[PDB]
Design a protein around this ligand. Sequence first.
Ligand SMILES: C[C@@H]1N[C@H](CNC(=O)[C@H](c2ccccc2)C2CCCC2)[C@@H](O)[C@H](O)[C@@H]1O
Ligand SMILES: C[C@@H]1N[C@H](CNC(=O)[C@H](c2ccccc2)C2CCCC2)[C@@H](O)[C@H](O)[C@@H]1O
Ligand SMILES: C[C@@H]1N[C@H](CNC(=O)[C@H](c2ccccc2)C2CCCC2)[C@@H](O)[C@H](O)[C@@H]1O
Ligand SMILES: C[C@@H]1N[C@H](CNC(=O)[C@H](c2ccccc2)C2CCCC2)[C@@H](O)[C@H](O)[C@@H]1O
Lengths: 442, 442, 442, 442
Amino acid sequence: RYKPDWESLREHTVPKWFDKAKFGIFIHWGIYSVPGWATPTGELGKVPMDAWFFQNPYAEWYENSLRIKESPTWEYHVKTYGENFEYEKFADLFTAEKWDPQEWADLFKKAGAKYVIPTTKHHDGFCLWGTKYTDFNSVKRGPKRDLVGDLAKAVREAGLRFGVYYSGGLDWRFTTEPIRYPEDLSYIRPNTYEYADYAYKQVMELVDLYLPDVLWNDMGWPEKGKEDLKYLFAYYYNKHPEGSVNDRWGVPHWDFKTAEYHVNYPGDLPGYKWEFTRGIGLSFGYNRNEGPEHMLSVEQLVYTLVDVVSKGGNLLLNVGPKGDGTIPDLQKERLLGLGEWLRKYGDAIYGTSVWERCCAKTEDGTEIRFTRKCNRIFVIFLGIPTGEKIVIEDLNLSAGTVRHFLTGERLSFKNVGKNLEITVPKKLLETDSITLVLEAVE
Amino acid sequence: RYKPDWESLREHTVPKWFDKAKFGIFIHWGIYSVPGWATPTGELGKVPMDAWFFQNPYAEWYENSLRIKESPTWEYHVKTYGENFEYEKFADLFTAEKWDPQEWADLFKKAGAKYVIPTTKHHDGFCLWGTKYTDFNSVKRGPKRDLVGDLAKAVREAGLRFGVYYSGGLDWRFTTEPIRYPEDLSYIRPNTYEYADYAYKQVMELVDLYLPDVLWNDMGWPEKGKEDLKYLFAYYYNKHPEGSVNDRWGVPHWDFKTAEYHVNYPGDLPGYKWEFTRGIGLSFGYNRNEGPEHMLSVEQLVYTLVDVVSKGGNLLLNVGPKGDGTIPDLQKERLLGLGEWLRKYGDAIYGTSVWERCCAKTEDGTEIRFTRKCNRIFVIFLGIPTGEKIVIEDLNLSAGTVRHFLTGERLSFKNVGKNLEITVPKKLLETDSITLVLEAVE
Amino acid sequence: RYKPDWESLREHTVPKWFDKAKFGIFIHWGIYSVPGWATPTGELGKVPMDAWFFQNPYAEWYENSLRIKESPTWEYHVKTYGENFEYEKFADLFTAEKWDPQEWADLFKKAGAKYVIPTTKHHDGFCLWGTKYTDFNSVKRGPKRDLVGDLAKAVREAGLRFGVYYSGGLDWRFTTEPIRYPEDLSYIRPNTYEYADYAYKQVMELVDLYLPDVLWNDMGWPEKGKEDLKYLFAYYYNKHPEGSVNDRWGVPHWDFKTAEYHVNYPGDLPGYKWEFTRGIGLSFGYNRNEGPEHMLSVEQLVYTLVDVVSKGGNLLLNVGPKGDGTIPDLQKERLLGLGEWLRKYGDAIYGTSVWERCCAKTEDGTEIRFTRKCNRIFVIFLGIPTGEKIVIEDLNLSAGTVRHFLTGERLSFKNVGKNLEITVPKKLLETDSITLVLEAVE
Amino acid sequence: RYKPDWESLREHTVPKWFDKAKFGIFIHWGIYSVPGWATPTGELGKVPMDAWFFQNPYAEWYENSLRIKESPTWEYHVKTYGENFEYEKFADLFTAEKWDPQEWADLFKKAGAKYVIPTTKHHDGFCLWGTKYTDFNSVKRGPKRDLVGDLAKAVREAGLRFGVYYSGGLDWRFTTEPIRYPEDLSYIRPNTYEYADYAYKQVMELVDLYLPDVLWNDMGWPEKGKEDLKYLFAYYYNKHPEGSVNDRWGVPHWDFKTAEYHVNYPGDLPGYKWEFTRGIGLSFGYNRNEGPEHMLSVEQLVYTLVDVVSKGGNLLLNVGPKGDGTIPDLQKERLLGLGEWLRKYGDAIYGTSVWERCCAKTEDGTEIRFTRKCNRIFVIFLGIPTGEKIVIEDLNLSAGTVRHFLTGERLSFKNVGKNLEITVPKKLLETDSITLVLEAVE
Ligand SMILES: C[C@@H]1N[C@H](CNC(=O)[C@H](c2ccccc2)C2CCCC2)[C@@H](O)[C@H](O)[C@@H]1O
Ligand SMILES: C[C@@H]1N[C@H](CNC(=O)[C@H](c2ccccc2)C2CCCC2)[C@@H](O)[C@H](O)[C@@H]1O
Ligand SMILES: C[C@@H]1N[C@H](CNC(=O)[C@H](c2ccccc2)C2CCCC2)[C@@H](O)[C@H](O)[C@@H]1O
Ligand SMILES: C[C@@H]1N[C@H](CNC(=O)[C@H](c2ccccc2)C2CCCC2)[C@@H](O)[C@H](O)[C@@H]1O
């Protein structure tokens, strides 16, 4: 039994299932999915913040962008939908006509994800469950259906864990001015006591209807409601000890931390559990402007995953569905690619722990990441070297046997000075898929 | 004029009428009165708290018990009313068909009570007055009548004082999870700001419609609303200086403290004004499972009253009416019994003050309680000794005359050592009713 | 067992000994007693605050007045002691050479007082006990003696209650600027954490060393130390249940309120226990500038006490000794005169309770005050009427026997309308001292 | 880089060295060691708190017991040292004449301990280092030596971790009244700003001078100084990432929880890291009144450690030296015995992790505990069965090979229903020492 207080809540640590699953699927789906439009300006952390809000690569931010008169979105909206076409009007166009929660679940499972977390309410305040605290929800408008619940049922039937995303920190249904600069965030918020209750009542409602595995909050928790989390966290943990929460509440407790695109990405081993998230492209909500030039390629996707996992994190890869519920082909292919690689290399991923170091490199520049499993150490190359002679810089192994992962073949290695030298038979180098994977056993 | 601040509010002390009346009637009446069912497990303070909520002897707690699947109440509810029979449905069955507020008032007056306090809203949130802050009240549902007001009119016309009970601390209309353990109480609460206002607006409303003599709150005051009491207490006291409040608000001010069954019952003279409450049985709300084996007998009732009064308290005895407004015969008889005893011995009760000691005993084990009235000291025996020679242990009187209360007959006494010896003529011992009462005059 | 929190501390109320004693002696004695000088401008409440600090009638305020250059005190100090004579230097002239605490204790007992309260530390920071928290105390300087201690032994020996006075709110040892306007008091205070600690440690030291009957604080408690009082009050009350504290701490608790000269003096019965304090003259500290024209007369003292007492107060009369330890004749006289009247009419004062009303007047304007003791109602005339027929305006006695208090003579009375008429034989009127006192009974 | 705020500090978790060491030595040595006396009333958790402080089994509490006049300690002090012997005087008898920190370090290493934690300052305020914040320390008085310092050099030399104990919650140098009831602890504390500063400055001084591996606070942290810990914890962790703090600060952060004798001792696996602490006898401070009948036996120590360790805890066994610096024979014996068992079975303790369950019992009641190391599961019997056929109640091994840990002998096992049966040849049962230890593998 957890008591409603920070000291006590600290007794709850990231659940084992979370540490072990290493990949999850994020779903930004909503009425913003209908216009499905954003200017693909670039990655968070690379785009200067003075312009960021004016050329927002995040399509879910459509309403905010639309509220900024004369911004690309505003221009696009006027031309395509007209001026007397309010953003809310998209709730009625959002019909999920082609949606089938089971094909989604089926796909995230073939993709190798171990959990799924849909936005139940994003910054625009539209709710994807039949909530009783607002009529701006998917049961009353558009889909005429409890998207959150129906997807929770499919995911779970598919054997995956189910979490929930909630925009606690922002709700444009309670503001009128758009965010034009990052400083605006410190005062352009619901700000009211009424809002702090709404957020509280809404997450409590998600807790009681779906008892999710992850409470994924975004943009901090309304200040007036922060003391409420002591109760909500205790209430939730007492109903679901294996439940978990992220680090976006602005209170003293969290089970795992988060990083988005470049922001907060650790350079080496952070000393805590975390999770990396990004979209397959530059946006989270679907964006019909993104081509594969903006998306990651299965290979980058794989490398991204390995680098995250070697540093102790989980990759929460986002998929951005269309207003009709289908998942754009460019994203489905990248999911399947990654699913394929995980089918071959999963063993050096799921259930692994960090090693003493995350990273290494070969004398010729190929990057190396490590993962552990008791006595086993996985040497994951971010690529497949050409020569049979591999020189790993600044590495010595006290081990004794160094197998070639996929085949199992004992290999020849020698600790030469500050380096490790291994000879990988071209036959083998030729069986690996995106990464050459070795396995030391000490 | 009281100012809205604790230091100032302290200038208000328990009103003289409250100190002097020594007996009041509590009424737990509501929609829980319809099922009128609880398992008579035992008295608060004797029943282990690990089981208490699962076998709740308090019938008003029916909804909480019903929310605990597979608990006696749940089993009983399913069998008797069915699963598709929600607790709220009882608001429509609660018709007070046989209710007559004047017969109630008449009865509490014959019973010797000096004030009356009905639950205006209990933990289930159903309100017994036409409140404007919820439609879950007795004017709109069931009785179709302002129970609170109509009973306030009768009580007052009968010459008694009228107070109000309000579940400030709990409101199941704002929670879904049941209390299974005492620890749950620290987080399973409305918790919202909206709720703190509701409670505030509701007690202010009772203040303006009925200007009650007692603000009897239960289960603490919502934390977010605690600072509001400075205003509400000032507002109330400025409209009714003789009004009063109990000690269940969790703030620095109170006029009298409370104890329930064994909990907080003082062993000797506490140094403050207090009030003891319990039901005639083990429940407050009516319970059709209680037989006289669970109730107190007029004698225990009398002894209970004397012991409370000798220690400076008031006894607030609870009566649990039926859904139709009648008061079960087992309770009416016990009220009348006590009313009868008070008719004979009231003088050594109402208007009395504590003495130097509350308690004493005779050499043969009969317990003695004392009460004062200026120069007069009342020696109230919890029973009627058999022999004409009474030896009171560890007592010496500097008095001079020791009368036999009911008759007035001067008696023979002698301070022998550490004891007091009195000779009570069998004729006299034979006129007393439940207690032998003497009266010293110093 | 009191707990350290306001709700619990509220359980402690004014000790019975305090309510019954009705007169105490205040002693403002310090190094300011040595110059013993002030402009006797008038009574607090009657002198405009725009002038007060510049023409301060309180001689204990000498240091403050002296810091206002060009002030009468400043003129007098330079002419009498020179410019190079720092106020602190008075600690060396303060010798108490002719001091006999037993003589003082006796004088306060003959005077009719039941408790005594000396200034242990006034605003100037000088401590009259061997405190370990500062060297500016009477043990190390001046008297080289613990005045607080020796006086407490002597008061106690005479069988009187001993309380302590402490200036928690001001300590000129922590400031340099004088108080010129009441407004200045809001920022010219010690203000440091250090000071709040000093204050707490010193009052604790006083409780530990002397366990006084009254903790009389003045001028508020340092804001940074207010939370400390929960702990200090619980600590004190647990060592001394019978102890008492006043209402000058600025926190939610106190056992009795206070009034100074005109300030907070009740017009009719307040609903709580209180104490009136003033000097015999206009100062607390000895003022050699006061003559009989600035003092109350024995008649006025008596009239004062009676009025206070009839409104449920205690009179805390101040005496201000000379720097040598002797009590000024003028002051001594008045004390002995009041004592003589208390010797005669004590029984209508000590141990009394307020009646239904405090006041009444005779047809010809003689003010009348009332006190009660059970069934007995004392009728105290502020003076002795000349005629035998007395008409009391707006009184009606439902009693039966009205007697002449001094002799016992039953007297003739008749309820004539909205008045009460009584005949008091001249032989009796001639025996009374300053007050005609009648005793009504039921 | 930790930041000074709870959210960030949460990133720091129990250092890996702590989780792996499984046993440390606590050293309660002070000037209370000189009288070294107490009534060995019983174990915390088993002795009623209404008596505890009056019959305190903790000899370090001598000063507190001594302030309760008419207490066994009081009787013994006056008979043994006289009425005029102030507790502080023990600082001069505390000489550590026969003290050799290297011998101690060695003894704790031979004993099998991995870290040592001496009391740097207990409730009596006496500091065993040359602190600059008080003269009541071991450098200026008694030993005229920095015990903390010399001991830290010596523990480190023996290759053990050194942590520090500090009584932040109590310091009898700041109070005068003894603790008689647990309730008294809520107000008889230093309470001053001054103290909160002293505490912070002293722990800082300890970090600066010795950079300990463990900051072990006791009795809570002064309320006025709690916000200070954000800064002190960030400062400490930034100098010593590998450092650790316990859970007795009363703030939202800690690296491991604690349990004392019966208090907070987990029944099954808690979900966090923790440490059990107790004396070998009933006291922490040396009690010359304890005999073997008051101490654990080597068998019991071993059984204790095993049980703790199987529930993820560390055993923090206390030794209480004599005033002369020598460790009492009885204590030494038990330490060397445990050491001998750790020498044999160390491998089933150090560096282990909890398994799925902590416990199991044999058909005939022998308790069984489990620990794991990767694929290896250690099966520790709290004793050695007499028969060769062993039936473990409610276990089932999906393993394959079960071996006799001491010899390696593979053994015969069969999953018989809800039980596991195994045959352990008597020649093997005869080689075990206090525990039959089996090792299962997969
Ligand atoms: C997963 C994504 N989360 C976004 C919230 N983003 C953040 O909190 C971003 C953030 C994230 C982590 C550290 C600092 C800032 C913002 C980027 C500039 C302002 C702060 C959402 O705005 C976005 O629609 C999507 O839900
Ligand atoms: C007069 C009765 N008051 C009850 C509230 N009870 C309390 O606050 C009880 C209480 C009362 C006094 C001290 C401590 C606790 C609870 C018993 C265990 C949890 C605390 C109500 O729950 C009950 O229905 C009825 O109104
Ligand atoms: C017995 C006397 N008490 C005085 C304290 N007086 C007050 O706090 C007076 C006061 C003001 C309000 C309530 C009660 C008392 C002050 C009149 C000038 C501004 C406030 C002291 O200043 C004085 O030296 C002496 O000790
Ligand atoms: C190792 C020992 N630690 C003791 C501190 N013990 C506690 O705080 C005990 C406690 C209470 C609750 C949780 C953890 C520990 C106390 C039992 C009496 C009331 C609370 C010290 O008092 C004792 O002197 C010694 O240093």
